[PDB]
Coordinates of N, CA and C in Angstrom, one line a residue:
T1 N 1.0 -1.2 -0.3 CA 0.1 0.1 0.2 C 0.9 1.4 0.0
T2 N 0.3 2.4 -0.3 CA 0.8 3.6 -0.6 C 1.2 4.6 0.7
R3 N 0.5 4.3 1.7 CA 0.5 5.1 3.1 C 2.0 5.2 3.3
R4 N 2.2 6.6 4.2 CA 3.5 6.7 4.8 C 3.4 7.0 6.1
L5 N 4.3 6.8 6.8 CA 4.5 6.9 8.3 C 5.1 8.4 8.8
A6 N 4.5 9.2 9.7 CA 5.4 10.6 10.1 C 5.3 10.6 11.2
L7 N 6.7 10.3 11.9 CA 6.9 10.6 13.4 C 7.5 11.9 13.6
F8 N 7.1 12.6 14.7 CA 7.5 13.8 15.1 C 8.3 13.7 16.5
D9 N 9.3 14.0 16.8 CA 10.1 14.6 17.9 C 9.3 15.8 18.5
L10 N 9.2 16.2 19.8 CA 8.6 17.4 20.2 C 9.7 18.5 20.9
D11 N 10.4 18.2 21.8 CA 11.1 19.3 22.4 C 12.3 19.7 21.5
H12 N 12.2 21.2 21.1 CA 13.1 21.8 20.0 C 13.0 21.2 18.9
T13 N 12.1 20.4 18.6 CA 11.7 20.0 17.1 C 10.4 20.6 16.7
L14 N 9.2 20.3 17.4 CA 8.0 21.3 17.3 C 7.9 22.1 18.1
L15 N 8.5 22.1 19.0 CA 8.4 23.5 20.0 C 9.9 24.2 20.2
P16 N 9.6 25.4 20.4 CA 11.1 26.3 20.4 C 11.5 26.0 22.0
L17 N 11.2 25.0 22.7 CA 11.6 24.8 24.0 C 11.5 23.3 24.3
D18 N 12.0 23.1 25.7 CA 11.9 21.8 26.1 C 10.7 21.6 27.2
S19 N 9.7 21.1 26.6 CA 8.6 21.2 27.6 C 8.7 20.3 29.0
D20 N 9.7 19.6 29.1 CA 9.9 18.8 30.3 C 10.2 19.9 31.5
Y21 N 11.6 20.5 31.1 CA 12.0 21.5 31.9 C 11.0 22.8 32.1
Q22 N 10.3 23.2 31.1 CA 9.4 24.4 31.4 C 8.3 24.0 32.2
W23 N 8.0 22.8 32.2 CA 6.8 22.0 33.3 C 7.5 22.2 34.4
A24 N 8.5 21.7 34.8 CA 9.3 21.7 36.2 C 9.2 23.0 36.5
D25 N 9.7 23.9 35.8 CA 9.8 25.2 36.1 C 8.7 26.0 36.3
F26 N 7.6 25.7 35.6 CA 6.4 26.3 35.8 C 5.8 25.9 37.1
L27 N 6.0 24.8 37.5 CA 5.6 24.2 39.0 C 6.2 24.9 40.0
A28 N 7.5 25.1 39.8 CA 8.4 25.9 40.8 C 8.0 27.1 41.0
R29 N 8.1 27.9 39.7 CA 7.4 29.3 39.7 C 5.9 29.8 40.2
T30 N 5.2 28.8 40.5 CA 3.8 28.9 40.4 C 3.2 28.6 41.8
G31 N 3.8 28.4 42.9 CA 4.9 27.3 43.1 C 4.2 26.2 43.7
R32 N 4.0 25.4 43.2 CA 3.4 24.0 43.5 C 4.1 22.7 43.7
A33 N 5.6 23.5 43.9 CA 6.5 22.3 44.0 C 7.4 22.6 45.2
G34 N 6.8 23.5 46.1 CA 7.4 24.0 47.5 C 7.7 25.5 47.4
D35 N 8.8 26.0 48.0 CA 9.1 27.3 47.8 C 9.8 27.4 46.5
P36 N 9.5 28.5 45.8 CA 9.7 28.6 44.6 C 11.4 28.5 44.3
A37 N 12.4 29.2 45.1 CA 13.6 29.4 45.1 C 14.1 27.7 45.1
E38 N 13.8 27.2 45.9 CA 14.4 25.8 46.3 C 13.9 24.7 45.1
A39 N 12.7 24.9 44.9 CA 12.1 24.1 43.4 C 12.9 24.4 42.5
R40 N 13.0 25.8 42.0 CA 14.0 25.9 40.8 C 15.4 25.2 41.2
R41 N 16.1 25.5 42.0 CA 17.2 25.1 42.6 C 17.4 23.6 42.3
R42 N 16.5 22.8 42.8 CA 16.3 21.4 42.8 C 16.2 21.0 41.4
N43 N 15.2 21.7 40.6 CA 15.4 21.5 39.2 C 16.7 21.5 38.5
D44 N 17.4 22.6 38.9 CA 18.5 23.0 38.0 C 19.8 22.1 38.4
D45 N 19.4 21.5 39.5 CA 20.4 20.7 40.2 C 20.4 19.4 39.7
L46 N 19.0 18.8 39.5 CA 18.9 17.7 38.8 C 19.4 17.7 37.3
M47 N 19.2 18.8 36.4 CA 19.7 19.0 35.1 C 21.2 19.0 35.3
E48 N 21.7 19.7 36.1 CA 23.2 19.8 36.2 C 23.9 18.4 36.5
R49 N 23.2 17.5 37.4 CA 23.9 16.3 37.7 C 23.6 15.3 36.5
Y50 N 22.5 15.4 35.8 CA 22.1 14.7 34.8 C 23.4 15.1 33.5
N51 N 23.1 16.3 33.4 CA 24.2 16.8 32.1 C 25.6 16.6 32.6
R52 N 26.1 16.4 33.7 CA 27.6 16.2 34.4 C 27.7 14.4 33.9
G53 N 26.7 13.8 34.1 CA 26.9 12.3 33.9 C 26.6 11.6 35.3
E54 N 26.4 12.2 36.3 CA 26.2 11.8 37.6 C 24.9 11.0 38.0
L55 N 23.5 11.2 37.0 CA 22.4 10.5 37.0 C 22.0 9.8 36.0
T56 N 21.4 8.8 36.0 CA 21.0 7.9 34.8 C 19.6 8.9 34.2
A57 N 19.7 8.4 32.9 CA 18.4 8.9 32.2 C 17.1 8.5 33.1
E58 N 17.1 7.5 33.5 CA 15.9 6.8 34.2 C 15.6 7.7 35.6
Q59 N 16.8 8.1 36.2 CA 16.6 8.8 37.6 C 16.2 10.2 37.1
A60 N 16.7 11.0 35.7 CA 16.3 12.1 35.7 C 14.7 11.9 35.2
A61 N 14.3 11.0 34.5 CA 13.0 10.7 34.3 C 12.2 10.7 35.5
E62 N 12.8 9.9 36.4 CA 11.8 9.7 37.7 C 11.7 10.8 38.6
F63 N 12.7 11.6 38.6 CA 12.6 13.1 39.2 C 11.3 13.9 38.7
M64 N 11.5 13.8 37.3 CA 10.3 14.5 36.8 C 8.9 13.7 37.0
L65 N 8.7 12.7 37.0 CA 7.5 12.1 37.5 C 7.2 12.0 39.1
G66 N 8.2 12.4 39.8 CA 8.0 12.7 41.1 C 7.1 14.1 41.3
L67 N 7.4 14.8 40.4 CA 6.6 16.3 40.4 C 5.2 16.0 40.3
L68 N 4.7 14.9 39.8 CA 3.3 14.5 39.4 C 2.9 13.8 40.8
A69 N 3.6 13.0 41.3 CA 3.3 12.4 42.6 C 2.9 13.0 43.7
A70 N 3.3 14.4 43.6 CA 3.2 15.2 44.6 C 1.6 15.9 44.8
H71 N 1.0 15.4 44.0 CA -0.7 16.1 43.7 C -1.6 15.3 43.1
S72 N -2.8 15.8 43.5 CA -3.8 15.0 43.0 C -4.0 15.2 41.5
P73 N -4.5 14.2 40.6 CA -4.5 14.4 39.2 C -5.6 15.3 38.8
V74 N -6.6 15.6 39.6 CA -7.4 16.8 39.2 C -6.9 18.2 39.3
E75 N -6.0 18.6 40.4 CA -5.0 19.7 40.5 C -4.2 19.6 39.5
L76 N -3.4 18.6 39.1 CA -2.3 18.6 38.0 C -3.2 19.1 36.4
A77 N -4.3 18.5 36.3 CA -4.9 18.8 35.0 C -5.3 20.3 34.9
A78 N -5.8 20.9 36.2 CA -6.0 22.3 36.2 C -4.8 22.9 36.0
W79 N -3.7 22.6 36.7 CA -2.5 23.6 36.3 C -1.8 23.3 35.1
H80 N -2.0 22.0 34.3 CA -1.4 21.7 33.1 C -2.1 22.7 32.1
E81 N -3.5 22.9 32.1 CA -4.3 23.8 31.4 C -3.5 25.3 31.4
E82 N -3.2 25.9 32.5 CA -2.7 26.9 32.7 C -1.5 27.1 32.1
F83 N -0.8 25.8 32.0 CA 0.6 25.7 31.5 C 0.5 25.7 29.9
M84 N -0.6 24.9 29.7 CA -0.6 25.1 28.1 C -0.9 26.7 27.5
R85 N -1.7 27.2 28.1 CA -2.2 28.5 27.9 C -1.1 29.5 27.8
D86 N -0.1 29.5 28.9 CA 0.7 30.7 29.2 C 2.2 30.2 28.9
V87 N 2.5 29.0 28.5 CA 3.6 28.7 28.0 C 3.6 27.9 26.7
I88 N 2.9 26.7 26.5 CA 3.0 25.9 25.3 C 2.3 26.5 24.2
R89 N 1.4 27.0 24.3 CA 0.6 27.6 23.1 C 1.3 28.7 22.4
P90 N 1.7 29.8 23.4 CA 2.2 30.8 22.6 C 3.6 30.4 21.9
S91 N 3.9 29.2 22.2 CA 5.3 28.9 21.3 C 5.1 28.1 20.1
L92 N 3.8 27.9 19.9 CA 3.5 27.3 18.6 C 3.8 28.0 17.5
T93 N 4.4 27.5 16.7 CA 4.8 28.4 15.2 C 3.9 27.8 14.1
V94 N 3.4 28.7 13.1 CA 3.1 28.1 11.9 C 3.8 27.3 11.4
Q95 N 5.2 27.3 11.1 CA 6.1 26.3 10.7 C 5.9 24.9 11.4
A96 N 6.0 24.9 12.3 CA 5.8 23.4 13.3 C 4.5 23.0 12.9
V97 N 3.4 24.0 13.1 CA 1.9 23.4 12.6 C 1.8 22.7 11.2
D98 N 2.7 23.6 10.3 CA 2.6 23.0 8.9 C 3.5 21.8 8.4
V99 N 4.5 21.6 9.1 CA 5.1 20.4 9.1 C 4.2 19.2 9.5
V100 N 3.7 19.1 10.5 CA 2.5 18.2 10.9 C 1.5 18.2 9.8
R101 N 0.8 19.4 9.6 CA -0.3 19.3 8.7 C 0.0 18.9 7.5
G102 N 1.1 19.2 6.7 CA 1.3 18.6 5.4 C 1.2 17.0 5.5
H103 N 1.9 16.4 6.7 CA 1.7 14.8 6.6 C 0.3 14.8 6.7
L104 N -0.5 15.1 7.6 CA -1.8 14.8 7.9 C -2.7 14.7 6.7
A105 N -2.4 15.9 6.1 CA -3.2 16.1 4.7 C -2.9 15.1 3.6
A106 N -1.6 14.6 3.8 CA -1.5 13.5 2.6 C -1.9 12.2 2.9
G107 N -2.5 11.9 4.1 CA -3.1 10.6 4.7 C -2.2 10.1 5.5
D108 N -0.9 10.7 5.8 CA 0.3 9.8 6.7 C -0.4 9.7 7.8
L109 N 0.0 8.3 8.4 CA 0.0 7.9 9.8 C 0.8 8.7 10.7
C110 N 0.2 9.5 11.5 CA 1.2 10.5 12.2 C 1.1 10.3 13.8
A111 N 2.2 10.4 14.3 CA 2.5 10.3 15.9 C 3.7 11.1 16.5
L112 N 3.3 11.4 17.6 CA 4.4 12.5 18.3 C 5.2 11.4 19.2
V113 N 6.6 11.4 19.0 CA 7.4 10.4 19.8 C 8.3 11.3 20.5
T114 N 8.3 11.1 22.0 CA 8.8 11.9 22.8 C 9.4 11.3 24.1
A115 N 10.3 11.6 24.8 CA 10.6 11.4 26.1 C 10.1 12.1 27.1
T116 N 9.3 13.2 26.9 CA 8.6 13.9 27.9 C 7.2 13.2 28.3
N117 N 7.0 12.9 29.3 CA 5.9 12.2 29.9 C 4.5 12.4 29.3
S118 N 3.8 11.3 28.9 CA 2.6 11.4 28.4 C 1.5 12.2 29.2
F119 N 1.6 12.4 30.5 CA 0.7 13.4 31.2 C 1.0 14.7 30.6
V120 N 2.3 15.1 30.4 CA 2.6 16.3 29.9 C 2.3 16.7 28.7
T121 N 2.5 15.9 27.9 CA 2.6 15.9 26.2 C 1.1 15.3 25.6
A122 N 0.2 14.6 26.2 CA -1.0 14.4 25.4 C -1.6 15.1 25.1
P123 N -1.9 16.7 25.8 CA -2.8 18.0 25.1 C -1.9 18.5 24.1
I124 N -0.4 18.2 24.0 CA 0.3 18.8 22.9 C 0.1 18.2 21.6
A125 N 0.1 16.7 21.9 CA -0.5 16.2 20.7 C -1.6 16.5 20.0
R126 N -2.5 16.5 21.0 CA -4.1 17.2 20.3 C -3.7 18.4 19.7
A127 N -2.9 19.5 20.6 CA -2.8 20.6 19.7 C -2.3 20.6 18.5
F128 N -1.7 19.5 18.0 CA -1.0 19.5 16.7 C -2.0 18.7 15.8
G129 N -3.1 18.3 16.3 CA -3.9 17.4 15.4 C -3.5 15.9 15.3
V130 N -2.7 15.6 16.2 CA -2.0 14.3 16.0 C -2.6 13.6 17.0
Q131 N -3.0 12.0 16.4 CA -4.0 11.3 17.2 C -3.1 10.3 17.8
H132 N -1.8 10.2 17.9 CA -1.0 9.1 18.6 C 0.1 9.7 19.2
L133 N 0.3 9.0 20.4 CA 1.4 9.8 21.0 C 2.3 8.4 21.7
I134 N 3.6 8.4 21.4 CA 4.4 7.5 22.0 C 5.5 8.2 22.9
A135 N 5.2 8.3 24.1 CA 5.8 8.9 25.0 C 6.1 8.3 26.4
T136 N 7.2 8.7 27.1 CA 7.4 7.9 28.5 C 6.0 8.1 29.3
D137 N 5.5 7.0 30.0 CA 4.3 6.7 30.3 C 4.7 6.8 31.9
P138 N 4.0 7.7 32.5 CA 3.9 7.7 34.1 C 2.9 6.6 34.7
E139 N 3.3 5.9 35.5 CA 2.8 4.7 36.3 C 1.6 5.8 37.1
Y140 N 0.5 5.1 37.0 CA -0.7 5.6 37.6 C -1.2 4.5 38.4
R141 N -1.7 4.5 39.8 CA -2.1 3.5 40.4 C -2.9 4.2 41.5
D142 N -4.3 3.7 41.6 CA -5.1 4.1 42.7 C -5.1 5.3 42.6
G143 N -5.2 6.0 41.5 CA -5.8 7.5 41.4 C -4.8 8.4 41.4
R144 N -3.4 7.9 41.5 CA -2.2 9.1 41.6 C -1.1 8.4 40.8
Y145 N -0.4 9.3 40.4 CA 0.8 9.1 39.9 C 2.1 8.7 40.9
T146 N 2.6 7.3 40.5 CA 3.5 6.9 41.8 C 4.6 7.3 41.5
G147 N 5.2 8.2 40.6 CA 6.9 8.6 40.3 C 7.5 7.4 39.5
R148 N 7.3 6.4 39.5 CA 7.9 5.2 38.4 C 7.5 5.6 36.9
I149 N 8.2 4.9 36.2 CA 8.0 4.7 34.8 C 7.1 3.5 34.5
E150 N 6.1 3.5 33.7 CA 5.5 2.2 33.3 C 5.9 1.8 31.8
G151 N 6.6 0.8 31.7 CA 7.2 0.1 30.5 C 8.3 0.7 30.1
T152 N 8.9 1.1 28.7 CA 9.9 1.3 28.1 C 9.7 2.9 28.3
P153 N 10.7 3.5 28.3 CA 10.9 5.2 28.1 C 11.0 5.2 26.7
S154 N 10.3 6.4 26.3 CA 10.6 6.8 24.9 C 11.6 7.7 24.7
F155 N 12.9 7.0 24.8 CA 14.0 7.8 24.9 C 15.2 6.8 24.3
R156 N 15.6 7.3 23.4 CA 17.0 6.9 22.6 C 16.4 5.6 22.1
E157 N 17.3 4.7 22.3 CA 16.6 3.4 21.8 C 15.2 3.0 22.2
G158 N 14.9 3.4 23.1 CA 13.5 2.9 23.6 C 12.4 3.6 22.7
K159 N 12.7 4.7 21.9 CA 11.8 5.4 21.1 C 11.6 4.1 19.9
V160 N 12.6 3.5 19.6 CA 12.7 2.6 18.7 C 11.6 1.5 19.0
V161 N 11.9 0.8 20.1 CA 11.1 -0.1 20.4 C 9.6 0.2 20.8
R162 N 9.3 1.3 21.2 CA 8.0 1.9 21.6 C 7.1 1.9 20.1
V163 N 8.0 2.5 19.4 CA 7.5 2.6 18.0 C 7.1 1.3 17.5
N164 N 8.0 0.5 17.4 CA 7.6 -1.0 16.8 C 6.4 -1.7 17.7
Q165 N 6.4 -1.6 18.9 CA 5.3 -2.0 19.7 C 4.2 -1.4 19.3
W166 N 4.0 0.0 19.1 CA 2.8 0.7 18.9 C 2.4 0.3 17.4
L167 N 3.1 0.0 16.5 CA 2.6 -0.2 15.1 C 1.9 -1.8 15.3
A168 N 2.4 -2.5 15.9 CA 2.1 -4.1 16.1 C 0.5 -3.9 16.7
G169 N 0.5 -3.2 17.8 CA -0.9 -3.0 18.3 C -1.8 -2.7 17.4
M170 N -1.3 -2.0 16.4 CA -2.6 -1.7 15.3 C -2.5 -2.7 14.3
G171 N -1.7 -3.6 14.3 CA -1.7 -4.7 13.2 C -0.5 -4.4 12.1
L172 N 0.1 -3.4 12.4 CA 1.3 -3.0 11.2 C 2.7 -3.1 11.7
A173 N 3.5 -2.6 10.6 CA 5.1 -2.4 10.9 C 5.5 -1.5 9.9
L174 N 6.9 -1.4 10.2 CA 7.5 -0.2 9.6 C 7.7 -0.2 8.0
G175 N 7.8 -1.3 7.9 CA 8.0 -1.9 6.2 C 6.4 -2.0 5.5
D176 N 5.5 -2.0 6.2 CA 4.2 -1.8 5.4 C 4.1 -0.6 4.8
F177 N 4.8 0.7 5.3 CA 4.8 1.9 4.4 C 5.7 2.3 3.2
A178 N 5.1 3.1 2.4 CA 6.0 3.4 1.2 C 7.0 4.1 1.8
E179 N 7.2 5.0 2.8 CA 8.1 5.8 3.3 C 7.9 5.8 4.8
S180 N 8.6 6.1 5.8 CA 8.5 6.4 7.0 C 9.7 7.8 7.4
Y181 N 9.1 8.7 7.9 CA 9.7 10.0 8.3 C 9.7 9.7 9.8
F182 N 11.1 10.7 10.2 CA 11.2 11.0 11.6 C 11.9 12.2 11.5
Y183 N 11.4 13.5 12.2 CA 11.9 14.6 12.5 C 12.3 14.7 13.9
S184 N 13.8 15.3 14.1 CA 14.3 15.1 15.7 C 15.6 16.0 15.3
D185 N 15.9 16.6 16.6 CA 16.8 17.6 16.5 C 18.2 17.2 17.4
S186 N 18.3 16.0 17.7 CA 19.1 15.6 19.0 C 19.8 14.2 18.3
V187 N 21.2 14.3 19.0 CA 21.9 12.8 18.6 C 21.4 12.1 19.6
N188 N 20.5 12.4 20.7 CA 19.7 11.1 21.3 C 19.0 10.3 20.4
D189 N 18.6 10.9 19.5 CA 17.2 10.3 18.4 C 18.2 9.7 17.0
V190 N 19.4 9.4 17.1 CA 19.8 8.8 16.0 C 19.3 7.5 16.1
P191 N 18.8 6.8 17.1 CA 18.4 5.2 16.8 C 17.2 5.1 15.9
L192 N 16.4 6.2 16.3 CA 15.0 6.3 15.4 C 15.3 6.8 14.2
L193 N 16.1 7.7 13.9 CA 16.4 8.4 12.6 C 16.9 7.4 11.8
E194 N 17.7 6.3 12.3 CA 18.3 5.3 11.6 C 17.5 4.2 10.9
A195 N 16.2 4.3 11.8 CA 15.2 3.1 11.5 C 14.3 3.5 10.3
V196 N 13.9 4.8 10.2 CA 13.0 4.9 9.2 C 13.7 5.2 7.8
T197 N 12.8 5.5 6.7 CA 13.6 5.7 5.5 C 13.7 7.3 5.2
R198 N 13.2 8.1 5.7 CA 13.5 9.4 5.7 C 13.5 10.4 7.1
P199 N 14.7 10.0 7.4 CA 15.2 10.8 8.3 C 15.3 12.2 8.2
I200 N 15.1 13.3 9.1 CA 15.1 14.8 8.8 C 15.6 15.3 10.2
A201 N 16.6 16.2 10.1 CA 17.2 16.9 11.1 C 16.5 18.0 11.2
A202 N 15.8 18.2 12.3 CA 15.2 19.8 12.5 C 15.6 20.4 13.5
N203 N 16.0 21.8 13.3 CA 16.6 22.2 14.3 C 17.8 21.6 14.9
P204 N 18.6 21.1 14.1 CA 19.7 20.2 14.7 C 20.7 20.9 15.7
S205 N 21.1 20.1 16.6 CA 22.1 20.6 17.3 C 23.4 20.3 16.5
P206 N 24.7 21.1 16.8 CA 25.6 20.8 15.8 C 26.2 19.7 15.8
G207 N 26.0 18.6 16.7 CA 26.3 17.3 16.5 C 25.5 16.6 15.4
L208 N 24.2 16.6 15.8 CA 23.0 16.1 14.6 C 23.4 16.8 13.3
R209 N 23.7 18.0 13.1 CA 23.9 18.8 11.9 C 25.0 18.1 11.2
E210 N 26.1 17.7 11.9 CA 27.2 17.3 11.3 C 26.9 15.9 10.7
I211 N 26.1 15.1 11.4 CA 25.8 13.6 11.1 C 24.8 13.8 9.8
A212 N 24.2 14.6 9.9 CA 22.9 14.9 8.8 C 23.6 15.4 7.5
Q213 N 24.6 16.2 7.4 CA 25.5 16.5 6.3 C 26.2 15.3 5.8
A214 N 26.7 14.7 6.9 CA 27.5 13.7 6.4 C 26.6 12.5 5.4
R215 N 25.5 12.5 6.0 CA 24.9 11.2 5.4 C 23.8 11.7 4.3
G216 N 23.9 12.9 4.0 CA 23.0 13.7 3.2 C 21.6 13.8 3.6
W217 N 21.1 13.5 5.1 CA 19.7 13.7 5.5 C 19.3 15.1 5.5
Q218 N 18.3 15.3 5.0 CA 17.3 16.4 5.1 C 17.5 17.3 6.3
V219 N 17.8 18.6 6.3 CA 18.0 19.3 7.6 C 16.9 20.6 7.4
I220 N 16.0 20.9 8.7 CA 15.3 22.0 8.5 C 15.4 22.7 9.7
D221 N 15.5 24.1 9.5 CA 15.6 24.9 10.6 C 14.3 25.7 10.5
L222 N 13.1 25.0 11.4 CA 12.0 25.3 11.4 C 11.9 26.8 12.2
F223 N 12.7 27.1 13.3 CA 12.6 28.2 13.9 C 14.1 28.6 14.6

């Protein structure tokens, strides 16, 4: 069949920001994560230790989910709407919307594939008209987020696993498509970029821009 698959990274690909950090910072600022100062300090110190190599990817993801564990899901929803209105929505650009819209309009099967947790990113996929989300999932039990990851994280090689698991759930596979596109900005996503037939380096980091040019991969600087 002639259908194509289109996969989109989120942070720094479709949005000119990191939705994971902005959400932490939004809760700190606003201040639903304790004293604002100490909250932002604890956020930055997490990113610093992760960036220096002192925390695992799992542990960083866990700290982020721990922000959800501190509150009722009813409060979290109300606060996320404010986050959407004040942070995410105004960073939506016509260029990012249009990259997605073009693939929707072609009939492509479209999914957002992101390490930022599905509580935080579900309404963002919806804001783009994208009906499928392949995100790190927070465990939810007994009406609350536990702070733990449910299943495989949608991060690095996990994005590949999760995408293949999702297609099989629909009774499909990557080679069923005439082409598969994946847009991303980061060397973290070389695994999924290598898996599809049309990798696109979107707003690439210097590392990924070098890899894109080496391999002849399309580059797009959306913003």
